[PDB]
Structure formats: C-alpha cells, structure tokens
Amino acid sequence: KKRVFTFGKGRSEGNRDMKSLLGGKGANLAEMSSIGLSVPPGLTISTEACEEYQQNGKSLPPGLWDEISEGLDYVQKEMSASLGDPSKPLLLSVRSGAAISMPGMMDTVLNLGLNDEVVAGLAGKSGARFAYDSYRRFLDMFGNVVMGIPHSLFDEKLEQMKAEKGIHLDTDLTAADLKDLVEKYKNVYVEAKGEKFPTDPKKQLELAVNAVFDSWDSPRANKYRSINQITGLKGTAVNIQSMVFGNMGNTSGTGVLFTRNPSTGEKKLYGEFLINAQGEDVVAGIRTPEDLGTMETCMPEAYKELVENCEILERHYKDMMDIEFTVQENRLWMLQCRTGKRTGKGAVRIAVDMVNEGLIDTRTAIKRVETQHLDQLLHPQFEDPSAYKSHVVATGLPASPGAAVGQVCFSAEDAETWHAQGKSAILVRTETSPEDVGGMHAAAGILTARGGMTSHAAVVARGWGKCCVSGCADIRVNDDMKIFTIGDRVIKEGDWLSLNGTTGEVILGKQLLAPPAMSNDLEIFMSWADQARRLKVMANADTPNDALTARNNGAQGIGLCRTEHMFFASDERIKAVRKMIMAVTPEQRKVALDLLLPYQRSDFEGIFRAMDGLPVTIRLLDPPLHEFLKIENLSEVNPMLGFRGCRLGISYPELTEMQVRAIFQAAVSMTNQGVTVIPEIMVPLVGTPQELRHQISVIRGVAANVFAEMGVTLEYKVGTMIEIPRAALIAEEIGKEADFFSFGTNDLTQMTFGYSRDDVGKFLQIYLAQGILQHDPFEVIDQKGVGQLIKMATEKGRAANPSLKVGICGEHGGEPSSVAFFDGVGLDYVSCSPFRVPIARLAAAQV
Amino acid sequence: KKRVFTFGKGRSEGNRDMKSLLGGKGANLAEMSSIGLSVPPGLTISTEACEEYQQNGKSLPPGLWDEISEGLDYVQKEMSASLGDPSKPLLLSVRSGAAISMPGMMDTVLNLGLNDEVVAGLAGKSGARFAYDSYRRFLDMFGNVVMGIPHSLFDEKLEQMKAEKGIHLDTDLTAADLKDLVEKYKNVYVEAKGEKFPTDPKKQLELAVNAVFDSWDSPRANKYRSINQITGLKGTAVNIQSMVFGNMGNTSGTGVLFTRNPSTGEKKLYGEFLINAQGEDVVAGIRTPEDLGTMETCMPEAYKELVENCEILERHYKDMMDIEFTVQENRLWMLQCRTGKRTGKGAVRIAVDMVNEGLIDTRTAIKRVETQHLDQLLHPQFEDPSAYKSHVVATGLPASPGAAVGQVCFSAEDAETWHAQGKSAILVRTETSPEDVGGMHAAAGILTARGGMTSHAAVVARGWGKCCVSGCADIRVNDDMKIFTIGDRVIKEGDWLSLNGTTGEVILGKQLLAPPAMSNDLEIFMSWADQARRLKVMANADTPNDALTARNNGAQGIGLCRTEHMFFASDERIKAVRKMIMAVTPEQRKVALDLLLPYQRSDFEGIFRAMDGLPVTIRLLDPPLHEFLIYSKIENLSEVNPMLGFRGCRLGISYPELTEMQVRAIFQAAVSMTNQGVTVIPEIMVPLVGTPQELRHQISVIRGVAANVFAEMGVTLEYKVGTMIEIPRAALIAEEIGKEADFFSFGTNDLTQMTFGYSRDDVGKFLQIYLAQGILQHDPFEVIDQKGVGQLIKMATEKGRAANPSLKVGICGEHGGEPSSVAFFDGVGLDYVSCSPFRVPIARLAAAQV
C-alpha cells in the first residue's frame, strides 16, 4: 500500500489521527500542514516500512526508495531546489518518531545534503559563516548519529582549534576558521572508522533512513519496550523534511514553548528562544536562551505570527500545546507540536478555564485531568501545627514537602512488609540506595541523616510527592539494635513518628492529618465529577477522625469499619484485649468480652456521630488472635488462613454476641439524638452459606434482645465480605441469605493467585521484569482471573436477590483501571482510604 | 393413603424394596412371607404414620386404628385366635424398624396381650409354667419398654423370691411360684409410677405403638441422626406380629445364624441356639447357647427346614444372610433376615465364591466388597523380618497386629500436626486416654508402656487396624524431656522407630514395609476390578522401594515423584542441601547445584529401574527452602505464610539454576537407563502455575536443558512437560495454559487450601466444630468438595481439553484414595488418579465401582 506521505503548503496526505503509521510527530506535522501553518515541507515513511525493514533482514523494500524519490520530487518542487545542486541546494533533516514518545530512537540529523560543492554555493547565496557552520554541524551530527562516532572526537577538534588559535567562544570563529574545522571534522571520519565521509547526498539520506530504522531495534529502545510492557508498536516513522535555518544571523533562532504555563495553568505563552542556533540548542544548556518577551521586541513579525499560530493550535487541538519552532530571517516556521505535559495544579486550571472559554465541555475536562494530576493536590497537611510544635525532637532538611505519620522501620524489606500488612511505615535510614526504592515507595515518609536537597531520598521522594526529611545529622541510626538516638533519647522499631517534610521537623508519635484541597477550580472540577459518576464512593474509616475526615472528602458512607482497629485506644483497650486473647475456660472468656462493651460502644458512638445520615458498614472481628503480642496454642503456620474471621466467631460465638450488641446499643443510643443511623453488619471470610446463616442467627438473636432496651425502630442489613474464592463459586446460595456483598480483593487476590503479600517480595519484582505479571495484582485488579470471580459472584448474587447491594472495600478502590472495571461489572460502590476518596471520585467519573 | 401392610402365609402386601415405608425389618418380613417361608403373621404400620404422629401432636391419624384392626382381623383369621379371648388367645409382639438400622428405637415387647383371664386360658391350653413365665416376661418387658420402669425393679422381685424361697436357678420355680411373681411384678407398676398395669390388650397395643413412635424422637436417635448427617428418613415402622413361643418346653427355642462364616467366608452355617427361651436370650449372655450341630440332632425336622430356608434365602437375596429364628415345639419360624455384616476377608471370599457358584456376576461382586473391607487386607508387613531381628530393643504386648515405621512423638497434638505435615508418626506415651484418640488416628503406630491386651490403645487400635504395642514395661517415658529410655539407651523425639504389633517388638530406625496381599480370591477379585475400571491408577512414589512396592500393587506408573523427598537419604544429601539452602551470590549458588547431579541422577535411576515401561511423572522442587533444619541467612528465609511464599516454580523462575540442575538430572538418568533396554517415558511437572507465562518460562528452560542434555548421546527420548493445577486462577485461565502444556495434574491439597481459605495445619481450632454443626458435610482434605473445588476441576478440565485434545489430565492429591472423590473424577472424565502406594488398591477398587 502507500508508505510515503508528503506534507507541504496547505496540503498533507495524513492527519493527526494516523499516529500508528506516522507517529505523533509525522501525524502532527501533517495536521499542521493541513491547518495552514508555515511548516517546512517533507515526507514521512510509514512505520510499516520500518516493520518490513526489520523483517526482510535490514533492507529497503523494492518500491520504497522510488516512492521516497516521488515524495522528494514533491519537496524539491515546492522548495524550488534539488538535493546536491550547488546552484539551488535543498538541505534536509531526518527525524524519528513513533506513535508513543520513547527513548532509543535515532536523534535527528540536521543539515543533511552537504559537501564541498554545495557549501561553496550555499556560502555564495546565504553567507559564508552560516554555510561552513552548518557543514560543521552536519559532519558532527551525521557522524555521531548515523556513523556511531562519539561526539567527543568532534568537540576535541573544536577545542583544539580554540587552543591553537587562542579563540575563546564559538561566536569568535571566522568563516575560514570554520572552513578549516570542516576539514578537521572530515579527518575524524578516517581516524575513527577508516572510511571517508559520504559526499553523495543520496547515500547520506539512505544511511540516515537505515539508521532510524536500526534505532527501533536499539538496545536502549528494546530495554524501554521490555520494561514498560509496551507492545503493538511495530516500528517508527521517518520524517524527511526541508531545512529552515535558525543560524543564518541574529534575525533567526530556535525556540520552544507551552501555550500556557504548565505549572500554574496561566494563559500566557511559556517558552524559551535562542538566537542564531539550530534545533535542540535551546535545551542543550551550553548557551543561555532568552524568554519570549525578548523575542517580542527583537523579532516582532515572527512573534505576532507565533501568537497567531498558537491561538490557532489551541483552537484546533482544543488543548494546551507543547511546540517547537524555528525562525529564519524573521520568518517563523513550525516544526513540532503535541499536547503539553503539565502539573496537577495546571491541569485542573487549564481544564476549568477551557470550559469557561467554551473550548471543551465537562466530559472532556474530566478526561483531561489524570488521577496522577489529582494525586499531586491531595498531599496531606497537619491539622494544627502548634499542637506538635512541642514534640519536635529533631529538625533536618525539608527534602520533599508533605506530612507523614507512621511507625519506625529500618529497612525497605520491612517497609514493603508493613505496607502489605496495612501499617503506615516511616523508613528511617542513614542514607538510601536504589536497592531501597521499592520499600521507599511503600513508606509514608522517609527520614535520612545524610545527604542534602539533592540526596537520593530527596530526589526520589520529590518525584513521588512523598514526605522526606534529609540530612538530619543529629540522628544516629543503628540497624543492628533496631533503634536510632537523638542525643540521649532512644527510638525503637515500631514506635510512632511524624515528619513535616515542608519544615523538616521530626515529631514524636501520631499526629492529626488533614486534606488541604482548597482550590476553587478544583472544587468546581470535583463538582463535575460527582455529577458524572454513577458509582458511589464509601470510605474505610475506623477512628472517628477518619470518619469526619472521609466525609469531608465527599464520601457517601463507610464501606468498611474494622473492629480490630478499635483496640488502638489506650492502656484500657490494649491491655484488655490481652484478656480475651489469653482466655481459657469460656467463663474466663466471657469476663473479658462483657467487660468491653463501653470500651467499644463509645468508640462506635464516635463513628456514628461523624457519619450521621449515611450508611456505615461495620465488619466483625477479622484477624487472628496471635497478633496482639497459652501463646503456643495460638501460634499458626499460615495465619492468613488460620483461626480467623467468622471462623473465630462461630467457634467462640460470644465475640460476635459482644460486638453485635455494641453496634446495636450504640445505634439506639445515637439514634435518640436525631442522628440518622443506617448500620450494616458484615461477616468476614464466608466460604460456606451455613457460616453466614450461623452469624445471621447470632445477629438476629442479639438484635432482638437489644431491641428490648427500648423501641426497636432501627431497621438494619447484614451481609458478607466476599474474600474466599469458594464464596464466588457458590454465591447463589449466599445471596439469598445476604443483604449486601462486599469484595475483599486483598484476600481474594491472595487466595486466587496463591500469593502471601508479605512473602511476595522474593519473586514479585522479578515477575514484573520478565513480563510474567503485567501489573501488581495487589494495586491493580486482575480482570482475567480475580475479575471472573467478581463477575460470577455479582451475577449469581443479583440473580438470587434483586435488591442486593454489591460493593468493594479492598485497596483496589483507588486504582482507576480497577474502578473502571467495577463499573463494568456493575457494582454499586467502591470503598477506599479517606485520602484516596477523591481519586476514586475522579476514577468513577472518567467512565 | 395406605399405611398398614399385612404379611402371612404365602402372601404379603409389601416387598424387600419398600424399606422407606416399612423399614428393613418389615420389608424383609414381607419378602420372606412372599417367598413362602414360615413367618409369623403380622402387619406393618408405615413410617408415614410415624411422621404424621410426630407432627400432629403425638396422636394417631384418623383412619389408622381402624386400618390396624383390619390387619389384625387378617392375623386373627390366620392364627384362629382373637386378641383378649381366653379361649383362643392371640399374643403379639411390637417391633420397631426404620429404613436404616439405628439406635434409640424402642426395644421389642414380646408376649403382649396378657392379663389374668388370658393367662388362665393360655395355661389351660399350652401349660401353666409356660403361661405364667410368658406373663412374667410381658410385665417386665412392657413396663420396661413402654412404661419407662427400669428392668432392675422386676429383676429384684425375682431375686427376692429366690431368696425368700431358697431357690437358686430360674428352672426351680413352679407354676404357682411364677403365678406369685406375676403379682409382685404387677405391684412394681404401682410402686414405680403410681398406676396399675393396663389389663386391656387394645390399650396395651396402643401404648406400645405410641411408644415406638415416640422412640423416633428419642435423644439417642436424634443424636445418631445429627452425628451421622442422616436426613430425609421421616419415621420408623411398627411391626405387630403374632407370637411364636420358644419357651413352651425343651422342643422349642430361639436362635441366630449367619448363612456363612462372617470372619472367614466359609460356606457353613454360623449360629447359636438356646433351648426354652425367647427372643434375644441367645445373645444376652446369661444362659450359654449351644451351636447348630446340637440342634441338628435334638431338633432334626426344624434343622432340615432351617437349612432349606437358608438355601432359599441365599438364592433369593443372592447374599450371605443374618437370620433370627424361633422354634415352637419342633416347628421352625423365621423372624428376621438381612444381609449379614462381615469382615474384609469374609467379604472377598463370599464375593468370589458366589461368583463361582453363579449366584452373582462380577459387576455385583465389585459393588459388594466395600473399600473399608479392602482396607482390612492392605495392612503393611515388614519386607524381611530377619533383617530387624537384631535391632529389637524392647518387646511388649502385641496389642493390635501390624507394622509401623515413623518418627517418635510424645503427644496427640504432634501426631495430628505431623500427619497433616506429611510425616509418619509413632505415638509413644505411658498410657492413652480418649483425649488422645484424634492423634491416635493420625499416628502410624502406637506404643504404650502400660495396660494389657484390653487397654485403651489396644482396643482402639484393633478397631482401626493400626499397629500397637501395649504394656512394654521396660520403657521409661519422659514427656517433659521428650525422650524415653530402654535400660541405658535413650531415644529422643523425631528419631526413627519401628514397631511390630504382631509380635510386640520395638525396633530401631526405619525398616522396609511391604504389602501382604496374597489371597488367591483377592487376586481374582482385583483382576475383576482392573477389567471393569476405566480410570487409570498411578502412584506417589519417591524412594525406589516405594516405586517397586507401588508397581507390585498394580500401579500403572508414577503420577507424582517429589524431588524434595530425594534429599531425605543420607549424610551426602542432607548436608549438601544446606549448601543450596544457604546460597547467597549465584557463584556461591552454582557450587551447590552443580555438585549435586550425581546426588540426584542415581536417586532418579532407582525410580526408572523399578518403573521401566510405565510413565514416571516427576515434579520440580515444590516446597520452600525454610524446612531443612546464619543470622543473616535464616531471617531472609522466614516467611509469614510458607504455603504461599517463595515456593514451587516461583523459586525456579527466580533462581533458574535449580530447574537447570534437576531437569538435567532427570534427562541424563533417562538416557543412561534407556541404553539398558529399559523403556523410559519421563514427564516433567511444574508446580504452582498461576500464569501461563510462568509455565512458558519453565518450558523454555526445560526445552533448553533438554537439547543441551541430548548432546551427551542420542536425542531419541521423546518427553512431556506439564503443570500441576494447584492455584484457583490456573483453573480460571486454563484455556491459555493447556495450549502450552502436555498434561494437567490437580494438586487438590493446595487447591482445597486456597479455594476454601484453609491452612490444614491450622484448621484444628474450628474444623471439628464445623463438622458438629453441619457446616461442612465432610472433611475437605479427605473428601473432595464437588460444589466448589469441583467446579474448578470441571472448568480447568473442560478448558484444557478444549484447548488441547491430546491433553492427559490426572490428579496426584490425597483425594486419589477416597472412593467418593474417585467417583467424582470419573464423572469429570479424568485419565488417572495418583495416590499413596498402599492406597493403590483402594483406588483400583474405587475406580471400578462406577
């Protein structure tokens, strides 16, 4: 079929939608040529020509070169110049471009088509210093990019001429000086490769095309595609384009810009421009580029034409654009455009402002603020700073701003483990290596005693937004004792610690965290997301601070309240749980449970007070007993699948009798003060329907006994958590007896894959390397496997009970691809951590 | 609808198939009456009358009593005697019976229908001492069984008259003496309950029927149905039957027999008979009953008629029969029959012999030897006794015969734990309580230093067939030190020990065990099972002794060879495994693996040598590293859930040099053993496959090391590589796995664990409680769960076969021996079941019985 697509004045054979055959670069070059912008004419060789090149043994196919000669005749016709003609020279650039921007592709060669004769005619036409400088550039770049010669061999001949002649800067080289450096660069070819330089532009061009195709199979490119699971791309496109020269004088240059400020969203051009240079010299950092307001004054015609063109591109693409442009003697040329990268604050503002401008609607605005944009705006702060100002023990460097509260761990292994166990971990070490990065991503905060603002932990944490305090030197860490000292004060492993990476303060114990999310444009945006979403969002709240904090983020109820987290209360809660954990005769056991209802009823009262009017779904006692650390009988080989959940609750029914009485008694109590209370009881680890029915009998019994204490007016629901794969297999029998389902996708992933999350680190990252797992199954839900159990359990459940409310309270409630999947299956709510609530609120809206 | 079914001379309204409405007793009474045997006439009240009684508030339904009177008119017409008529008295028995033999039902009342007038007429007709003796029996039984008076209150009036009169035995009481004891028994009623005895036989009968119906709701019956998951039976039947009298004199009696010997299978009548007694007096053990050879001589007409009737019953039912019969004045009467219980040895012999007689065919013979019969014949023995005769350290009592080889444990907790972990455990304790029974069922052998042949461990172990040595007194056990001493010699926990419960010998260390299965009738029987079965049976063999031992039991190959079990050999294997277990840098790791191929290739050579000609399926290294028992090394190996940790193919994709090692070992031993003409069909199984990419990774390593190994010589060996289906996700995405796999094998241990969410070693805190309250109908680790795990087995087999038609699908879990599971795997359409070597014949029988 057709594999060469031209583009020129007002016409182009392709468009912005054909990125698979033309890459974003060639596609957008065609689109800008169609729109009518001044785009240098050229042609694009298809990615299917690259696929055919890579499969026929690195050769051009028969028709390809003649088809290239056809497109070159089009470029030569429009430019009125032939390749290799010293009278009317046509100089080219060879550019790489795939459908996705990626490393390993061949760098662009500029000023192609030069030799001694052409430079003579070019110097005659357009100035000598320009011509020999461009020929210097060509020899350097062509040898570098096509012939594999290092750039250093050319730079050393440059510095050698600067020394031998006594010149200082590049600008102080004469035309004859550059004419000699041309000869030196030509000699580099013979000195390095043993072959002289191609004088024939047709062979120059062919070697450049072959090199761009060869770059598709480059090791850096193969490593990028292998490490990012990047499939489906079958090649790169080659863009041969006529040269415009930003180095003919001081009325020429090269520049880049965003059409709006990518950090702040401000509707002002944000770019750089360098006078008398080519290509990527504005980004290379040797010469200092100037801002656009400088070009407004010294190149006014090109700046007016630039503002015009940027207004046209925002109108056409309907988005903020990242642009490359080049001016040749006051005449502007457009050479690349694409949708510009921006921050979260910029994405929100540009989105909202573009709605107010009538450029896009709200559905596209929701689809243009990524969840990673929104994550940059949900970093927590401390509730009241003056509360901790007396608990500050140390003060280091404010490496990455934020606020973290967690437990002290001294290894990245324990950080991955404690994050998998549900703890909040603060990784304290003298310094961080890349071998720690995995655990560094698991920790809520990082604390190092070494390194500065450009430390490893500092830079790494800035990329993530994690809180980090660096170079806190008064800390002395001791990994062998699992302790660090601040002066005379010792801090052991597992102790609570807080970090203010904005001020660099190290703070004792737990502190109150709050969301800051105050932006007016953000409030409007999340208003759009709440209107557009079908799926509801609940929260995973245990403490009453987390309930109000969750409700403030827009939560429509609590989908999971863990009762075991109620035992982080005080001396009187933590010490009393040991009584039930070391119970012997059920007479001895009933003395610990019946001495605990005020210990939980007031705790539950805190939850109902914050969440009045919205459903609160409380689970029963899930985890096993031997993690509140006689003790030999409690030790288990696999505590993930041991005496746990409803299994300790059918055995030992007095625990269920206790906590179910606490929830109902707090429900009646809080209901009398006008607080509307809709409670739900969730039974964990249901694998058989008789397990559920046993807990329903205990729930109905204790409920009717509790409704002796006053009026019985409270209507309630009882349901299961779907954690066990068998529950999904026999859900038709479970759904008849259940009021709601809630998928526990942590335990369901664990038992479906056969993975213990705490023990997965010895192989998991290795599986991610070799493409065995496309994603982390604990972060992203597995649609082909676990998803079938979610699908069948939902279908069987609904078919056995039409009024069945089905949700999910796993860690997957925040991940956007998972939330997209749960809307696919047709769930009613997702439940996630309180600070993750807005992420789900956006993810539920983007489908 | 119809609720009373009569039975009498040559006719009966029911048949042996109507056990739901008539119970086995009433059904077989009807069947014997139809065949033409002398069965006393009576009637059967349906179980539906019992169901309706239990739901209407303990009352008779409307027409039932008139319906009972219709059947009694039939019984009265045949016997020529009316109920309550002193001229022609009809005496009855009231018998219980449900569809399944079960406790809690009411014991039978005999001699019903007596009072002062009736006994006067009965004494006038048939003898006085007979009549008052029968009236004595009636008051005693009727008060005991219907009125809830203890039997002791009647027996003490008997012994009180024997004391006050000076008589010794029952025979020395005259008619007038029994006539007085009758008055004493009547007074027992008033002394115990405050009410006198029912004189009206119609009220006597109604109270007896009400009592049988009430017995269905008795606590012992409710406990039996609750503990054995017996649903759907909705009542018991009532059999009212005319009395025949085995106590009229010395030409009458009661007897019982099996038609053949239930222990040995001998085709000779095996029974007892007691003269001048009623009902269960032959079994009660107060008087000494006589054998049938006595009855042959002193009651010849009844014994000819008895042999005739037993020949007729074996002909009709086509089985060995358990019978009750009663003689009244040289005339034989049949009162109960049913298929007799017998042992394994008897079941096999009677089955085979009945085939040779052309009474039953082979299909029914296979369905008449239960797997629990066959388990009584597969108890292992030692390979050569003389080998250990010099290692005997102690000698105790031969409590229960057998042979056990295992590790020494000192608690029932460690016995349950070590049996769940896969170890063979020998429970050594001073004596055994019932609190140990659970662990006693887990141990391969029991050793006690106290108690005799009737000890707790002795009797318990005889019921199971487990090896037990009792009362070995020269042993001194110390549970706190985890040790026991024999004289000066100390034996620590975990040490290997062997026991011969047949001779009572205590033996040092491991010994070679062997099957004894030598019976010619058994060999013929298992020949029939092998012909009838579709499903193949493989073995789970690791040691070369287990491979030949398995091949001897009829195994058609090895379905699972655990490579980790190759390391439990000697100093040079157990010490070398610690090198690979403590490997750090892959230069350090490759020094332990490459120094181990002869360590495993000779081990594998032992397997190929025994299993020439049949497929051997070897799995890769399954279990995690941290169970081969350093501060930086042992902490990295400690895991929270070692069942789902760095395990199986996960350490084998990570650290690919382990797979590169053992895959080279299997192939090099394959070529080596193939050159000596031994036909070798090897198979490589990759465990814990959850993603198809895990499998394909191991296939690339398997194909690579295979082609490298075929540089050593010829590549003539064609092989198969496949997965074990342990992970539920593998069943969910089996369509992608079957394309890259040559065979599947379901690991139903791990699959049950991950499907239910159960850790087997941690299930004891709740499992038996779940078995109580009917939450789990069966143990999911012994019996396969069809509604749940079975769906994953079903879909993985269907998807696998649909993606690869030549896919051989089997199973090598513990469920390969359970008959209900094997029945299920034939249902799904598997190709083989693989199980332990001594369990091989059980599967061979279970695969045949469908």
Ligand SMILES: Nc1ncnc2c1ncn2[C@@H]1O[C@H](COP(=O)(O)OP(=O)(O)O)[C@@H](O)[C@H]1O
């Ligand atoms: N034909 C041309 N005339 C002038 N400048 C060009 C031409 N082709 C490319 N350039 C410029 O030279 C540099 C190299 O281009 P390119 O490698 O396409 O950018 P990218 O960094 O996306 O790969 C850029 O500054 C680009 O604008």
Ligand SMILES: Nc1ncnc2c1ncn2[C@@H]1O[C@H](COP(=O)(O)OP(=O)(O)O)[C@@H](O)[C@H]1O
């Ligand atoms: N009508 C009868 N005449 C004589 N003997 C009877 C009569 N009914 C039952 N028997 C005998 O009395 C005893 C009662 O047996 P039964 O307990 O009814 O059967 P089982 O306990 O086996 O279910 C047995 O010895 C039986 O043979």
Ligand SMILES: [Mg+2]
């Ligand atoms: Mg560019």
Ligand SMILES: [Mg+2]
């Ligand atoms: Mg859970």
Ligand SMILES: [Mg+2]
């Ligand atoms: Mg009987």
Ligand SMILES: [Mg+2]
């Ligand atoms: Mg396994």
